[PDB]
């Protein structure tokens, strides 16, 4: 997260770290056995780490559970990143409490101007790599479709939305991919891509979760 702030330990109880011997992507807990992340964060050998704050220290509250299966969206396109969503089922269910809790799926899509919270352990510099030990947070508004398409002409599908600041300085970045964009207590986006990090006129692009609620529900129900 570039231009963000320290969230505070466990203030984002649905945030998870996908780990394969190091932190590589973020994700969101939606029920005690399922997490949602981005399809391009897929790999085998994934351990889901819940209740984390400092990812390099066991401070307490952590639950490390292996993934039993990852379900990448059948229409995911690695070249355009269209349908960049993946569901991970956990080997055992997580114990939910106040430090580990799930976030709700939306019933409607959010509108431009809606303010949302993006969190993650991704890079904090737009030029160079500086990864943090604790969770970083950023409040960012959803932008209008016209400003998003003007910024990335030909690359935005109806399953993506832009959120951020056109002046630059605040944005999600590498290491944040797969994590949550929460607005009014509902999971509305998944960190997906962007051009560099916090560059002027190049806001972040997120997977539009409201277009996948029936797919998420039907898939969890049959697995
Ligand atoms: C499969 C992963 C281990 C590799 O993931 C990645 C490798 C290189 C860059 C990214 C990445 N750049 C990103 C930029 C942004 C942004 N809003 N500017 C957001 C997420 C990003 N994720 C990324 O997610
Ligand atoms: Ca820790
Ligand atoms: Cl266009």
Short mmCIF file of C-alpha atoms and ligand atoms in Angstrom, two decimals, residues 149 152-156, ligand 3:
data_model
loop_
_atom_site.label_atom_id
_atom_site.label_comp_id
_atom_site.label_asym_id
_atom_site.label_seq_id
_atom_site.Cartn_x
_atom_site.Cartn_y
_atom_site.Cartn_z
CA UNK A 149 -11.73 3.95 -19.15
CA UNK A 152 -6.81 2.56 -19.23
CA UNK A 153 -8.50 2.78 -22.64
CA UNK A 154 -9.38 -0.66 -24.05
CA UNK A 155 -8.42 -2.49 -20.85
CA UNK A 156 -11.36 -2.16 -18.45
CL1 LIG B 3 -12.69 1.74 -24.06
#
